[PDB]
Enzyme design. Structure first.
Site, short mmCIF file in Angstrom:
data_model
loop_
_atom_site.label_atom_id
_atom_site.label_comp_id
_atom_site.label_asym_id
_atom_site.label_seq_id
_atom_site.Cartn_x
_atom_site.Cartn_y
_atom_site.Cartn_z
N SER B 366 41.79 51.46 37.47
CA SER B 366 42.34 50.39 38.29
C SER B 366 41.17 49.76 39.04
O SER B 366 40.61 50.39 39.94
CB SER B 366 43.40 50.90 39.26
OG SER B 366 43.59 50.00 40.32
N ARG B 367 40.80 48.54 38.67
CA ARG B 367 39.63 47.90 39.26
C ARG B 367 39.81 47.57 40.73
O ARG B 367 38.81 47.32 41.41
CB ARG B 367 39.27 46.63 38.49
CG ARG B 367 38.42 46.86 37.26
CD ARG B 367 39.28 47.38 36.14
NE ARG B 367 38.52 47.57 34.91
CZ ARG B 367 38.27 46.60 34.04
NH1 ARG B 367 38.71 45.38 34.27
NH2 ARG B 367 37.58 46.86 32.94
N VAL B 368 41.04 47.55 41.23
CA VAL B 368 41.23 47.39 42.67
C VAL B 368 41.03 48.71 43.38
O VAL B 368 40.35 48.79 44.41
CB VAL B 368 42.61 46.78 42.95
CG1 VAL B 368 42.77 46.52 44.42
CG2 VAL B 368 42.76 45.49 42.19
N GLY C 152 35.53 48.64 31.79
CA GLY C 152 35.73 49.70 32.75
C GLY C 152 34.56 50.62 32.98
O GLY C 152 34.75 51.70 33.55
N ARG C 182 37.49 37.12 35.59
CA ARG C 182 38.74 37.09 36.34
C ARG C 182 38.61 36.26 37.61
O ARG C 182 37.60 36.32 38.31
CB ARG C 182 39.16 38.51 36.69
CG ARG C 182 39.26 39.41 35.49
CD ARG C 182 39.18 40.86 35.86
NE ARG C 182 39.28 41.72 34.69
CZ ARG C 182 38.27 42.01 33.90
NH1 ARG C 182 37.07 41.52 34.15
NH2 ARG C 182 38.44 42.79 32.85
#
Ligand SMILES: Nc1ncnc2c1ncn2[C@@H]1O[C@H](COP(=O)(O)OP(=O)(O)OP(=O)(O)O)[C@@H](O)[C@H]1O
Ligand SMILES: Nc1ncnc2c1ncn2[C@@H]1O[C@H](COP(=O)(O)OP(=O)(O)O)[C@@H](O)[C@H]1O
Ligand SMILES: Nc1ncnc2c1ncn2[C@@H]1O[C@H](COP(=O)(O)OP(=O)(O)O)[C@@H](O)[C@H]1O
Ligand SMILES: [Mg+2]
Ligand SMILES: [Mg+2]
Ligand SMILES: [Mg+2]
Lengths: 187, 491, 442, 470, 105, 128
Positions: B366-368, C152, C182
């Site tokens: 989860s990049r947040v 990632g 993004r």
């Protein structure tokens, strides 16, 4: 809208354009008129100068069909025929119009009921038996039909004759009979 | 050759009806009507056939228009009349849609009556740019321990649920939807989350079962269900995610917080591939069109958290992706993994090993991250995450047994979304060491008993942890208090 | 100028037919009758006065017959010091809501790469502070860097660390080109630059110019936004003499946007699915990034590797276009070690004893060897080294300090300290201190 | 009505040019001048007043220019109770030589799927008497089932055992649609249903209607026979309210036939090679096979898996349309375990503790957990041997092998192969036997004591026999 | 003169379709109008597919294309030693022209 | 001809893999879309309309029969290939010949565990 299907069907862009022209003329009864029309326009284009003016891919379509508008308003052409050439320059199918002309010719030659027959011989035919077999040929077709008989000669068939009535085909040649006899003698 | 060089057009063009706002069908087949005329029609404009069917002008070609049909082409014949309506697609939005089940165009299909909304919104609207947004800060609670602890999702994030067939993706989305009942039932208005479920290319029986599951959990009065099922035309399954996204963008633009689930996007990509191949567009990889990344990207980029100058609303997206034999190196999985803000990867081997939800924490992300967590869950989850990573890399006896303890700790049953305080209670009980004395097969029995106990006995502690959001030092001592007492009294 | 008409609109590809005044390839055309500016970039001449074009924003609402004006030149963006601190999209309009970009000069984004006689040989290492990067594959001023990685592994956080350290410690007008990334991350980067003083909204002293073509844009925009960033940096090098930084994130989005344009541009596809024109088009792009005798442009490029392959045509084509590539691996990223730089896949052209020196070169080779072979003492030293390659509060570890620390681990001077006292620390001092504390407590 | 002329014949794809009165899509056309009735279904409108059509029979002997007549309606088949005990082909003609099917009404084989407001939710387990099915993936009354399998793994034997058990115990007008299967199997089914009294050749009280388009049929017949049988079942469900069973074997042949004609319809091929319209065709067909609030259709479908892929677009697309998938495996059938159901790949929607109960659910989950552990151990088991496993690991492998063997079962329709008499294990015997094997109550029995038995009583008896004789 | 001089009919991504040039040989080097050069790789009935030794931005539909009469050849000899040339033998080292006396295909 | 006139024929196709290869050549030269292993979509139909004509008629249609023994050649013993599984889907059984058994002197190298005959018992003599 309903369409008049000619008695023969030609295909390609030539076939489609000529079918359109035929079904247009048949609803106004102006078929031989427009044949003389496209005859005329075919001889218009077959001369080299504006033939090169119209096959040039570096003209603008507006320029080419502007000259076409000019020369078609010259010879008091029917709206049907002017419209056809306007459409052929619109769609850029102009250089192929000879073919369309071609198509139309063939089409109405089965409208008049002509049947093309081709008699290949090994010898340049005599006149007597030429029209002899013409009379013979006459009996195959229904009335209202006209033989377009064009007898060319090929001296390799070793005699007899090879007659093509449209796509019907009688091979009375002697070379093929010799081949058949050889096959029967071997098998 | 040439679509409009048919003999009919040509003949009554040489010999001599509005062809600017009206066309005629040259050829209909497989739901793709070529239309001659319609010279004024815009790209992606919605046109109307004679039989009441609608279409979308997708291919503006020099001599004809490739229109995709919104229905069954048996009602469209060659030569039919096609009218313009002048508009791009639009769907009804508003509060009147909550609790209703609509199709990909906003028409009710639950027979409760027509929709009574007052606002319509386009479906091809653009996303908010750089300036209107703000960093993702508020937590979106899924009620799932593995997600809310290790893969936290915030309001305005786009978290991908990816996995093979029958691994638990729809169950994760449905638990997430059910979990917001504790927030929508209260009165604190800025914790309420309105949900939208987009069902793309599923059975109608599956969507009926899902609506019943939501009604039996009382989670329909704040949910919208957009349903483009398997029998619906490919344009409708293609358009459903955008309709749902606009229905949620209403909530986003008006200072409310919406959650949208695309279940799933693989079938949307399949519908778009069908429409594109039938429109003769050049196929690409796996026959998918070249602009399918553009498709999923302009869909998913509309999930944003607006800043306080733009109302402060949000839209959270949970796209679903089905991989074939765990192969994420495919085309659509690659695209949607590169688009989203992290993935909840569900495995099949983990599913049958009893690990359910079968979340692969090694591959999830989860990049947040902790920015979307409450302080308490952060305090427990940092150490939990590092513990599990250490365990997995050497999956030294202490590491192994502690990791197995945590793995048994993360299991959770279906349709039981836990409030965040109880999740923190469990993770505390498990991480500070109080489960090293239990053999792993009893960790589940513990969790169950311990939480029965802490919900019956310690409502004040859970209430203060919910009030403040963190584990206060007094509350820390009270947690150690309770877990020590219970581990003593446990068997 | 020259006026044409739209004849076909298929997806993101628009065909325009010009009566007179045919525009050359790569020109920009403007569509008339639209609220927002819609630019079409010419791609092919199809004969009969018709050109094919790629749109720069969505093509909804276009009508067959809509007039189209010809710019007469490629996409011209405003260049100059007035672009510093602003955000512009692929066509040079501001998207930060602060007003127009009043510059004195406009530059076309399609320009020729520097010549051969303009080439430079000077290679001066730029030390970044990070132990793994500056030790194994350190960066060189003037050279292209590249940061490969899957989804990632930590590429954008790596480029963020680099932005912080380098762009703050630099006086050369950096440029950031966001190629199809993004919008959330772009907004966060903007707001984190503002509050860190690198961008000054008042009394402009800003030192970074941002260009953003993001994911929800058509493929043409994401294919040309890297060229827009190139053009800004090329101004700051050509006509300013500065030594520019160019952070391109992410460049694989540029490649995949090329794939998506080729899809319908009417061209047979090559391997995997990319265009026939991948290598040479990415090459015409990547050759404008160089050190001429006028100035330098050192480029930090984050590169997206699909499915962690590294043999995919786009990464494999980019590899040859960079001077010090450091690849972020997934397998090391799941170890919790950060940054996720792959020590056995990150190559530097300045890691030779004629430039870095005896000691640094020997440390680099010895560390790489002991990591490759990973004798129980060797495996223990290798795990200690794997831990000490990590860098978290943030750390700043100077070059000589890190070569000293990795020597002290390599020689075995600290084989008694536990393996995870080196995890997430700075130099050898913080490692021995964390060993101190963790030892006396546990 | 309208009359047209054939203008092109390519395989099963016939282009027909009409001069006036173009026929709507999906209509049936009768080719004039043939010995047997040849029907063309309209698929596209090519323009030029030409249509493209798919032929329901052979196209040999067709000449360009042949007359074609328009029917004005899609393929209509006779529907009613008079279809019971009869065999009909794709276009509703009797192919059993018993005269015309004199029904009062005919239905078009193309219809609209039931709406969303007609869907039913009820979920009640349907007990089949098969161990692995009833334990790990129970079927549901009124739910679509689907039996996936490669070539020669047990699809038809399993579907015939299900026919035997369920259909014989049933009372609700079963229907069988043979799609692209062996004509030999169709004859076998016809005659074993005649002898068992399910089909009554006289004094008609039959309770099964057959519809057959087999491997020998052209692609159009193999692509519409499923719709024909579907239409018969839809009549029995809607206009009678009956509780219908519908067996379809094999339903991959529908997709395959669509793929065979797709190339000739001039469509760009999708992935693998199938038609671009694979999923929507499967959806329009499969959304009509469903339970509504008007009646109930229990749908068992055999699904061929090409080259044992399961990621081939046809099986992959079928998966989403089923409520209880049963996936057969070749690797299991090579061990001799029949039915070759894969325990770790067969799912169900009623496998829920609030439907099957906590006992059943926990036993199933434990069986799957132990089998998964065995699978994960298998690699080092075959590399190093079992001699290196932990003692707990040796115990998990022992119980896992025992559960493997106990999952197999002799089939009544497989006496010719197994030599044993077919066993029909009811549900509680299954649950109890597997619970006991899990608990460890049989750590002493040899593993071969569980292979091909009924309930666990037979397993203990077989163990006793092995111990005394050997 | 449409036998030793063609005219560009189309252009895109490096490929010049040229109408005319009825006497050009396969793999002959032609010269566009803007100074660039190309090789006649495809000899089709209606056009010639030429590959451009340059860029598409400078040539444009309608440009003129002359023909040289010889197959592609380079300068060879001792004079090239020490020199950096491009794929055609033109010096790119700025040291002047190549004094080569022999050409070779 | 024999099957229809009350006589009994047997037919061997040696082999069907080469007929599938020939049909793939014809289909690819006809520009038809190639599926798995470049085989056309209707290679199953190719073999199934053929092996379906091997029937056993009843005594009202003459009582004749036609037995077919199609031959299929696998690569490296792979039976899960495309054409092998097609013909396994069509036929009534197999006779798996193995290379391990054939090399080990066991000839005929029939794999008894994998060879099957779906009809089988119904067509044996009593003594056998
Ligand atoms: N946390 C869980 N615990 C136990 N069972 C679960 C859990 N999650 C899902 N399941 C079960 O696993 C099965 C698959 O669940 P689900 O359908 O929601 O996943 P899916 O990804 O949507 O699969 P599909 O391909 O059918 O869409 C269901 O029976 C579900 O009840
Ligand atoms: N200091 C840190 N602490 C924790 N996680 C971090 C830290 N730095 C980076 N990460 C993680 O790195 C991962 C990769 O993020 P990102 O840079 O977006 O990846 P990429 O650019 O390679 O796609 C994220 O999951 C992020 O949380
Ligand atoms: N329940 C079973 N018990 C024993 N053998 C079986 C069983 N099911 C299938 N088989 C064997 O597997 C073979 C294939 O069976 P079948 O289902 O007819 O193939 P298909 O997969 O094409 O439908 C059968 O001939 C039979 O020998
Ligand atoms: Mg689901
Ligand atoms: Mg990134
Ligand atoms: Mg079968």
């Amino acid at each position: 809208a309903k369409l008049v299907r000619p008695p023969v069907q030609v295909y390609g862009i030539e076939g489609r354009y000529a079918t359109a022209l035929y079904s247009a003329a048949s609803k106004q009864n102006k078929l031989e008129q427009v044949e003389k029309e496209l005859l005329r326009v075919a001889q218009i284009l077959k001369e080299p100068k504006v033939a090169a003016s119209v096959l040039n891919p570096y003209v603008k379509r507006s320029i080419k069909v502007k000259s076409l508008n000019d020369i078609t308003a010259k010879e008091r052409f029917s709206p049907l025929t002017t419209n056809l050439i306007n459409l052929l320059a619109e769609n850029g199918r102009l250089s192929n119009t000879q073919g369309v002309v071609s198509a139309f010719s063939t089409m109405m030659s089965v409208h008049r009921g002509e049947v093309p027959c081709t008699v290949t011989s090994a010898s340049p035919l005599e006149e007597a038996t030429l029209s002899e077999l013409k009379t013979v040929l006459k009996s195959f077709l229904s009335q209202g039909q006209v033989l377009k008989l064009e007898a060319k000669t090929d001296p390799s068939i070793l005699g007899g004759m090879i007659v093509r009535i449209g796509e019907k085909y009688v091979d009375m040649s002697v070379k093929t009979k010799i081949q058949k006899l050889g096959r029967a003698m071997r098998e | 050759t040439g679509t409009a060089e048919m003999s009919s057009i040509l003949e009554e063009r040489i010999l001599g009806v509005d062809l600017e706002e009206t066309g005629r069908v040259l050829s209909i087949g497989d739901g793709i009507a070529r239309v001659h005329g319609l010279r004024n029609v815009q790209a992606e404009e919605m046109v109307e056939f004679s039989s009441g069917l609608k279409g979308m002008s997708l291919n503006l070609e020099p001599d004809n228009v490739g229109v995709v049909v919104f229905g069954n082409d048996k009602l469209i014949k060659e030569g039919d009349i096609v009218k313009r309506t002048g508009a791009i697609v639009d769907v009804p939005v508003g509060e009147e849609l909550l609790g209703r089940v609509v199709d990909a165009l906003g028409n009710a299909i639950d027979g409760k009556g027509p929709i009574g909304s007052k606002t319509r919104r386009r479906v091809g609207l653009k996303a908010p740019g750089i300036i209107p947004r703000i960093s993702v800060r508020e937590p979106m609670q899924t009620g799932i321990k593995a997600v809310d602890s290790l893969v936290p999702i915030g309001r305005g994030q786009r978290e991908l649920i990816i996995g093979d067939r029958q691994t638990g993706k729809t169950s994760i989305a449905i638990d997430t939807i059910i979990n917001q009942k504790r927030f929508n039932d209260g009165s604190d208005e800025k914790k309420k989350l309105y949900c939208i479920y987009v069902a793309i290319g599923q059975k109608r029986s599956t969507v009926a079962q899902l609506v019943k599951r939501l009604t039996d959990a009382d989670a329909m009065k704040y949910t919208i269900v957009v349903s483009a099922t398997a029998s619906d035309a490919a344009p409708l399954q293609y358009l459903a995610p955008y309709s749902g996204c606009s229905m949620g963008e209403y909530f986003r633009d008006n200072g409310k917080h919406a959650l949208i689930i695309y279940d799933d996007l693989s079938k949307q990509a399949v519908a778009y591939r069908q429409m594109s191949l039938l429109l003769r567009r050049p196929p690409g990889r796996e026959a998918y069109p070249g602009d399918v990344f553009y498709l999923h990207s302009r869909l998913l980029e509309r999930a944003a958290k607006m800043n306080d100058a733009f109302g402060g609303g949000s839209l959270t997206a949970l796209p679903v992706i089905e991989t074939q034999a765990g192969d994420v190196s495919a085309y659509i999985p690659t695209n949607v993994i590169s688009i989203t803000d992290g993935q909840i990867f569900l495995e099949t081997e983990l599913f049958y090993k009893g690990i359910r939800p079968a979340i692969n924490v090694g591959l999830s992300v989860s990049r947040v991250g902790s920015a979307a967590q409450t302080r308490a869950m952060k305090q427990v989850a940092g150490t939990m995450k590092l513990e599990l990573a250490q365990y997995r890399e050497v999956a030294t006896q202490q590491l192994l047994s502690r990791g197995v303890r945590l793995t048994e700790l993360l299991k959770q049953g279906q349709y039981s979304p836990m409030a965040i305080e109880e999740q923190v209670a469990v993770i505390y009980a498990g991480v500070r060491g109080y489960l090293d004395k239990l053999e792993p097969s009893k960790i589940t029995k513990f969790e169950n008993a311990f939480l029965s106990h802490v919900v019956s006995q310690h409502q004040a502690l859970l209430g203060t942890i919910r009030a403040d959001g963190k584990i206060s030092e007094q509350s820390d001592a009270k947690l150690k208090e309770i877990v020590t007492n219970f581990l003593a009294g446990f068997e | 100028a020259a006026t044409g008409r739209i004849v076909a609109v298929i997806g993101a590809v628009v065909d325009v037919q010009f009566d007179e005044g045919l525009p050359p390839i790569l020109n920009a055309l403007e569509v008339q009758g639209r609220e927002t500016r819609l630019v079409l970039e010419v791609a092919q001449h199809l004969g009969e006065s018709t050109v094919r074009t790629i749109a720069m924003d969505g093509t909804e609402g276009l009508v067959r017959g809509q007039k189209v004006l010809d710019s007469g030149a490629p996409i011209k963006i405003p260049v100059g010091p007035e672009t510093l601190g602003r955000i512009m999209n692929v066509i040079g309009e501001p998207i930060d809501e602060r007003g127009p970009i009043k510059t004195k000069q406009f530059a076309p984004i399609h320009a020729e790469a520097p010549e051969f006689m303009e080439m430079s040989v000077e290679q001066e290492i730029l030390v970044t502070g990070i132990k793994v990067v500056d030790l194994l594959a350190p960066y060189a001023k003037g050279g292209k860097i590249g940061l490969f990685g899957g989804a990632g592994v930590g590429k954008t956080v790596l480029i963020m660390e680099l932005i912080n350290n380098v762009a703050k410690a630099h006086g050369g007008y950096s440029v950031f080109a966001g190629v199809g990334e993004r919008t959330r991350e772009g907004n966060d980067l903007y707001h984190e630059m503002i509050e860190s003083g690198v961008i000054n909204l008042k009394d402009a002293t800003s030192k970074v110019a941002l260009v953003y073509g993001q994911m929800n844009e058509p493929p043409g925009a994401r294919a040309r936004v890297a060229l827009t960033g190139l053009t800004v940096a090329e101004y700051f090098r050509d006509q300013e003499g500065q030594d520019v930084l160019l952070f391109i994130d992410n460049i694989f989005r540029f490649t995949q946007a090329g794939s998506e344009v080729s899809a319908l541009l009417g061209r047979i596809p090559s391997a995997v699915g990319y265009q026939p024109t991948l290598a040479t088009d990415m090459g015409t792009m990547q050759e404008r990034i160089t050190t001429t005798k006028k100035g330098s442009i050192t480029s930090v490029q984050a590169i997206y590797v699909p499915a962690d392959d590294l043999t995919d045509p786009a990464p494999a084509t980019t590899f040859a276009h960079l001077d010090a590539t450091t690849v972020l691996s997934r397998a090391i990223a799941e170890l919790g070690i950060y940054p996720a730089v792959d020590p056995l896949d990150s190559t530097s052209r300045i890691m030779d004893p004629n430039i870095v020196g005896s000691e640094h070169y020997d440390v680099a080779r010895g560390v790489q060897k002991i990591l490759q072979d990973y004798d129980k003492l060797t495996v223990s030293r290798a795990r200690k080294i794997q831990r000490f390659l990590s860098q978290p509060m943030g750390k700043l570890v100077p070059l000589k300090e890190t070569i000293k620390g990795f020597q002290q681990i390599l020689a075995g001077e600290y084989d008694h300290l536990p393996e995870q006292a080196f995890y997430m620390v700075g130099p050898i001092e913080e490692a021995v201190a964390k060993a101190d504390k963790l030892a006396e407590e546990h």
